[PDB]
């Protein structure tokens, strides 16, 4: 494989800190806040 050829020469890829589950949780929180409150959850409390 090409990935193993990169790995065998000291070239590694670090994983991201935030996984796609937590990114989707952030987008779900923003979407639910926007739907249920408008701009008020961005200005202050929902």
């Amino acid at each position: 494989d090409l990935i193993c050829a990169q790995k065998f020469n000291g070239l590694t890829v670090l994983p991201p800190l935030l996984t796609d589950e937590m990114i989707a949780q952030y987008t779900s929180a923003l979407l639910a806040g926007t739907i249920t409150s408008g701009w008020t959850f961005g200005a202050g409390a929902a």
């Binding site: 790995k7 590694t12 670090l14 994983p15």
Partner: peptide, 30 residues
């Protein structure tokens, strides 16, 4: 992984991209 030496002298070791059964408490992360 360490806190400051002003706080403590205790460290943890992260072996990157290595399975925990292939190393020369133990936790396994991605």
């Amino acid at each position: 992984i360490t806190p400051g030496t002003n706080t403590s002298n205790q460290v943890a070791v992260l072996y990157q991209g290595v399975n925990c059964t292939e190393v020369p408490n133990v936790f396994q992360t991605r």
